[PDB]
Design a protein around this ligand. Sequence first.
Ligand SMILES: CCC(=O)N[C@@H](Cc1nc2ccc(C(C)C)cc2s1)C(=O)N[C@H](CNC(=O)/C=C/CN1CCOCC1)C1CCCCC1
Length: 357
Amino acid sequence: LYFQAMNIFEMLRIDEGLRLKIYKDTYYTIGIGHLLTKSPSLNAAKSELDKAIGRNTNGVITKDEAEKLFNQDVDAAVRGILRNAKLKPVYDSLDAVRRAALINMVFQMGETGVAGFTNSLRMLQQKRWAEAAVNLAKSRWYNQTPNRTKRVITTFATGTWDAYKNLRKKLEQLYNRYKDPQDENKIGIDGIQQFCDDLALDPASISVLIIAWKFRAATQCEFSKQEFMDGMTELGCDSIEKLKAQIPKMEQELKEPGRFKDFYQFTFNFAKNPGQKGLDLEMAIAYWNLVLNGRFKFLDLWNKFLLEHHKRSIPKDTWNLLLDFSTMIADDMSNYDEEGAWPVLIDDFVEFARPQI
Ligand SMILES: CCC(=O)N[C@@H](Cc1nc2ccc(C(C)C)cc2s1)C(=O)N[C@H](CNC(=O)/C=C/CN1CCOCC1)C1CCCCC1
């Protein structure tokens, strides 16, 4: 296998993204789109992953492990392309860099999807790079993934890694403005403040929390280099101005209850201290005031109730269920099911609140 792929791993890590934990596909997946099983059983998915890696991974792997899986998929993709009468001649005719761009297309839309680009593939085989680049930009492929597609088209247009090299340069330069002087691998207190200042936003604002959700950031007041790099690339941003222009789209998403529920539950995980399973009361109240503002009629009475009668940590299930409570609760609380499976804390709140109407 060693006689037969160095830049291809980084090309698809940028275009498709690298996931280190087993995730749900629109199917059990890990790494750069590696399929584990067609089964709906996670036990089966973990078994396949454990067999493929050679250890009890419990659904979590390293980047080197993700690379080993990726190299297997590249090889399988190459075998498939060569068995395809519509793709083999174009693949054979192409140089190493342009083959990597064709494998990228196969990874995205499969062989049948790629074979559909008959006019474009002909131009590539004919080495009419300018004509092929213009033609590929006309497709729906270009609108569905404009950032990824432009990068792949550039690879076919130039036969170089310039689209990937230049994105990484732009992000690396931008990163240097925010990196911690005491730790190059992260953005510190100062850096996060600067990032927020550059976006003309307060670091405790709802907009910054929406950005944190979109970046899948782990913890408040922390921001790793990997979080910044992956977040900026997944969002198709290479500057603060581009990220700033993405905020209204992120805001519109939250008007749909499914997205709002995902963001609301993410807030708990983001707000909590690493090493703690619960969220401290003062912190829970501060984030509730931000995310439940204009969504929960009883928010202030809830805060007063907790500060005087609970005075303890908030578990994840209670945090999650509070959104369901806020949605269903009547203004007079007359519809509250005192025997309807709510946490005891919410039964206690309704008992405390009801005399005050
Ligand atoms: C709402 C967004 C939100 O979580 N902001 C973080 C700050 C941010 N975190 C990230 C992380 C990542 C990224 C990326 C996505 C760009 C942006 C940011 S900006 C906040 O102010 N957290 C406080 C809580 N925590 C603190 O007050 C911690 C203070 C630190 N110590 C040590 C230094 O001296 C002071 C004490 C709350 C925010 C809500 C209102 C109450 C305070």
